[PDB]
Symmetry: D2
Subunit: 393 residues, 4 copies
């Protein structure tokens, strides 16, 4: 959108929430006071509709964020969660019952898989898997009991991009009433407009790019009108909420999301292009890089890139080589999470990736390195990476 940046600056900022400041007020509250019985009745009737009722439903600060998220992702409502993993687990749980079946991409975030295999399984809900590029063939995996189809594009760690139009079309042909979900964290909800593709719910670890500074955790799930009420009421029955201050900080992160993502795109594509020419690199998994799995879909369906990608080295590094490589970076830091201002580096052994690719086998044998490209000078990052290569040459 030629207006995305204006939208990011303004989303959620209504006078009833800001009360004269630029940002929403921070309203910290469990108790919300009813001046009269009539006010209490009105609040009770509208307790899920943005009238102050009880802190577990939200205060003005949450309502402001919810409105911002619905504007930006084009949904009827936005559920809030203590983190991304809580958003995934509780959004799925909100729509499954015993005897149901979940069809999930085998490139899904590992905690999302483990929720399915270790929590859903014991509650009489089964989970099947599909390859991220299955396209229309996903119709062959839809079972009569399949209630949820769970997408994640690009995939975790390995970055494969779905053909969402093909998947959604097939799904709607066989099971039109299915709930289609996507973990849209990589796109920060704004580089891939999931609800415009017929997906029902767009889930985010707002922890990542929305917070944008590695110092807050929160999950969001923006649902279309069809699914909102079931998502909202079942998530609430599980007590799912976020504190008002983190909600404020997520709204605040939105304001710089455009300038941040443009830099992450520029810098990470430059690094990926360099890696793709490098003699010590076997493969580069960057959706914006020509040749990456699902790249043509990224070009067609996304409006940009973020800064997280991965590449495969020429060999499965030993523990000793991993230390010489990873321990001595000057700018990249080893840590989980991503989407912040700093660059991060992590290693995944191929066998370990195989272990979180259910009913599939990986097609590489070198150590996989996942990079988050932050806001540092890109030439300094390249020098850091080159020093890393020299330590394992």
């Amino acid at each position: 959108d030629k207006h995305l940046d204006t939208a990011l600056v303004n989303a959620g900022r209504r006078k009833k929430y800001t009360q004269g400041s630029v940002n929403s007020v921070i309203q910290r509250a469990s108790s919300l006071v009813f001046d009269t019985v009539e006010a209490k009745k009105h609040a009770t009737r509208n307790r899920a509709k943005g009238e102050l009722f009880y802190g577990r439903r939200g205060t003005l600060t949450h309502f402001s964020l919810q409105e911002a998220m619905c504007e930006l992702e084009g949904g009827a409502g936005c559920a809030l969660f203590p983190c991304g993993a809580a958003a995934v687990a509780n959004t799925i749980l909100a729509f499954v019952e015993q005897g149901d079946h979940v069809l999930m991409t085998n490139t899904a975030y590992e905690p999302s898989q483990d929720f399915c295999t270790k929590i859903l399984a014991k509650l009489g809900v089964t989970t099947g898997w599909f390859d991220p590029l299955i396209g229309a063939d996903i119709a062959n995996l839809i079972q009569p009991n399949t209630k949820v189809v769970f997408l994640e594009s690009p995939g975790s760690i390995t970055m494969e991009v779905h053909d969402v139009p093909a998947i959604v079309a097939a799904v709607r042909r066989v099971a039109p009433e299915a709930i289609i979900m996507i973990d849209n964290t990589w796109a920060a909800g704004v580089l891939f407009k999931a609800l415009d593709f017929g997906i029902d719910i767009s889930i985010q670890a707002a922890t990542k790019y929305l917070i944008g500074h590695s110092d807050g955790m929160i999950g969001t799930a923006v649902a279309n009108a069809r699914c909102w009420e079931q998502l909202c009421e079942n998530a609430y029955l599980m007590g799912q909420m976020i504190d008002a201050d983190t909600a404020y900080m997520t709204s605040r992160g939105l304001r710089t999301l455009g300038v941040r993502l443009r830099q992450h795109h520029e810098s990470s594509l430059r690094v990926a292009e360099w890696l793709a020419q490098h003699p010590q690199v076997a493969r580069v998994n960057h959706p914006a890089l020509p040749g990456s799995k699902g790249h043509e879909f990224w070009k067609r369906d996304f409006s940009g890139s973020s800064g997280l990608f991965s590449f495969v080295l020429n060999k499965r590094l030993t523990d000793a080589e991993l230390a010489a490589y990873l321990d001595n970076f000057s700018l990249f830091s080893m840590a989980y999470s991503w989407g912040g201002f700093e660059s991060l580096i992590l290693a995944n052994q191929p066998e370990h990736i195989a272990a979180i690719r259910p009913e599939a086998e990986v097609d590489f044998s070198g150590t996989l390195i996942r990079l988050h490209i932050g806001l540092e000078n890109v030439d300094d990052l390249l020098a850091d990476l080159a020093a890393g290569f020299a330590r394992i040459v």
Copy 2:
């Protein structure tokens, strides 16, 4: 304990968390940085044991609170949640599988009931009910599939106190492996030492007295050694956590919990004694008041009282009488939640209470008024209540 106040002041405050200040540092984080591969391996091995690993597991701020809660309630570990309702729902969920049965007091908090009837039911887990005074007779309700027995003493709104020794003994005679849980919010975890009575897990809406100021929401669940790992790992698979700042504010609330509770006890018992003599009052439900349901158990099993209690008026007030009464209080405010510094008032119609007392019928027909007695001058509160009575005489 003659040392409870010293314990409250000091619990959780170790140098590794406070780093020279009186209170723990606030460490806001998703990304936790591993300086070396060996540090990452050590953190991974100990990722549930208080080594910094990932923000979803906690930072130093969470670890400090967890240690404080385990010291005060005598547990092996403490799981953290976005609110009390999340603690209840996810602690139960952590121990049930399809085909299991939950036995819950029919005086349980309404959201706890609704979690059971609207979430568990659809996942192949059934829920039966028991009267809060069932004592040893609870053995007759234990089914072969009963995995969880859920206590709440005193009960929500109506304040009936369990005979926990009798309940636990019966349960251990019939189903020793059962998971016995209690919602110990009213006692703030410290006026009733649940794990000392053979209960497995003590759950709190820390939102209430631990936060103590009506401006933060958080749930806790402190488990014995038998149950800790299952609670911890399954809650984590559901993404359950609290933000670091609210964890800091819960630790901070602990420091004044003793002085606060002593005032709430004194003031509320005085109000209850006055109400018990009042011609417009049919019943007073205060566990510390002679004559209240389960009072003798409160005297035997609790080390004090908090400030929440209820009473029954002589009549079922109409909507109009409810407004004349509730709208014109000067000091009491109408709001949900409790456990703060201010006094609160809410009305519950008898028919409404009947509706949240499954497989039971209430034994009163007047409107029930629930009072939270805060830190105001008690004589001013009495004058406010007297003015209320005059408006409906």
Copy 3:
């Protein structure tokens, strides 16, 4: 007042600030938005009168605290500062110019003295000193150019209590238009109602008991109608303000100030009475203890005590004894500040105190110990002190 606890719970909490919650909202702002030119003009006219104008003047959060402090201390306005030392320095500075003279108690807080001797002096403002028990004889020290009379009752460290009625009556006889100020931190502004005694400005380190938890730092100055505009505008010209969050935490602290102070009073008076009987104690300096300097004025003029006081040992400790004593306490900690939930201990040799008693000597030769008595169980604190005495006997 028989309503002070009700006032503490309710002060500053108007709907325009709370907007539905129990506590005021936290409005973080520099920019405050004017919808129209007319709105901008109105805000400009009322920029010192609680209309949103610019964050340096305050937001809703500051206005709420300002109203609370004016209600509790009975003033026309309350200026806010980054800490207590800033409140003292800038409140004095607001009322002086080259050629003026300040008359200050020689028991004033050491940073207050240093502000006078190291900042004011080179700006052409002289400072004279008086003994805290001077009473009516202060009239003899008033010079033609005396502009400010600065009180601190009880005094720092040595705890001498002024005869404020005698001092004020004498000042008003000679210099009726003098600006009489007090550092009222020990009373937390509520145990001694300074403005009711004819003092013009009551200054506090809200850092201490108002915050109550040893984390936030903030200064306040509550002025009568005669002095408010000059205080407000001149402090504003020095850019003095506090952040919105600390202002929120100060308002929040007020709510438990009554229950906290009653415990600090009860426990510190007990400790003082015990020390007074102890053979290793030469003197106890506690305003509430009979025999302490100015005790009779404390009993007449205050409505209670806080928890800070000092005592003099029966000997001068050697450096080895100071370490053996101080290094090995179990519950008392060595730190500056006070007014929190935990107990603190510091030591000073007589000549250290003499060096901060301008134009005076000290009347003791033993080591002085300053104690802050927190919220721990008092018998535990007594055992800690007894163990310390045994280490130096």
Copy 4:
């Protein structure tokens, strides 16, 4: 510098402050605990050198920000203040005494001027004024008692850029030991490396671009080695500090300062170039625009631009036209401050500016419009300005 973005991401982030997280911990404290007498002595000796001593000196959070600011601005120390106006007032005050003279640019921020004329003057410190383009001719205004030369480049509102090399060389010829200060807020301390030009102290309203989101208020002053101790100790005697949380939020703001400033530069230069072509615009005052006063010094001496500038309309608006223009913008808002993510607009008549140009007249007669260009899509901002022009044509 080709490393400025890497420096912004990493400045101040040492392990002793971050303790495992990406950002520094937030250590809220007044009291800082000494485990032993020897530890207390060590902290005392190093109380201005980054050892924990007392919260008025700072905690780990402040130390981290101080180190970041010294690295980025190339100074020996950084003093912290509650807002920019406090930093200006207290940094000047730290270096003057009765009989001294201050020489200030007549384009200085109005509160800075008012501090000089309304506070300093009655303390025996005189202030003289100079035109911002005076250059080497400032030598003729240096008096025997001139102690401080105060620069502000670009100037407030009218944006004139000094020739700092010429000014500094002239001052050093006549008064080599003068204290040369600059309010470097517009450059955010990084677009103009003041200390590299021989300026002694670089002051900022960190409120503006460092915070970057219009919420926090904070002042900073970075001094060279010659001036640091006097600045530090005299600001400390006035109690000047910032709260730990705002210090954290300032460090956090640094991380996105590069990506934000590049957008503000690009967008504001585009708007300025467009306004310069517009028939309703008489003049554009933007340091980066050719023809603007001192533009050539901006191009030589700065490494970029921020987003604040002004322009002069082709006529003097009537009051009716001012309302029609200002009241009806869709994206630009009327508010004070700047440096955030959103665009702002204010107006001043020529005589308003003349009244804050001491000893000078203004050289324009049209209404002056000050714009802050935020992060919105620039074509949307242009359309908003075009619609405004149509309302007054």
